[PDB]
């Protein structure tokens, strides 16, 4: 059993008010069963697209979640992952950069 690494990042340069895409890349996990949620201010974002799951040379899985978003001064964005290798769900926040 291996731990999922999570990385949150924007497609385009982040400008407050301006539409964009927010990516959540989950990697290095096993087994393949996993639950990925993208959060706005703690609430689950509705229209989230998922790439097909695949794996690397080393047999570890990866998947890309993404969603449309517009950043602001106030709103927080996060990626929440539940996986059997962790006791509690892990949450990484978009660091606005």
């Amino acid at each position: 059993q291996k731990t999922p690494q999570i990385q949150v990042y924007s497609r385009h340069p982040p400008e407050n008010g301006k539409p964009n895409i927010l990516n959540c890349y989950v990697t290095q996990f096993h087994p393949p069963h996993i639950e990925i949620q993208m959060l706005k201010n703690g609430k689950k974002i509705p229209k989230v697209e998922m790439s097909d799951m695949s794996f690397s040379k080393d047999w570890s899985f990866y998947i890309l979640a993404h969603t449309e978003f517009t950043p602001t001064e106030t709103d927080t964005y996060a990626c929440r992952v539940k996986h059997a290798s962790m006791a509690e769900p892990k949450t990484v926040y978009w660091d606005r950069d």
Binding site: I21, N23, S51, H66
Partner: peptide
């Protein structure tokens, strides 16, 4: 850092 994928088949690096 690592090469990270975008949803539109382009790449991201920092």
């Amino acid at each position: 850092g690592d090469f990270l994928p975008n949803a539109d088949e382009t790449w991201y690096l920092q």
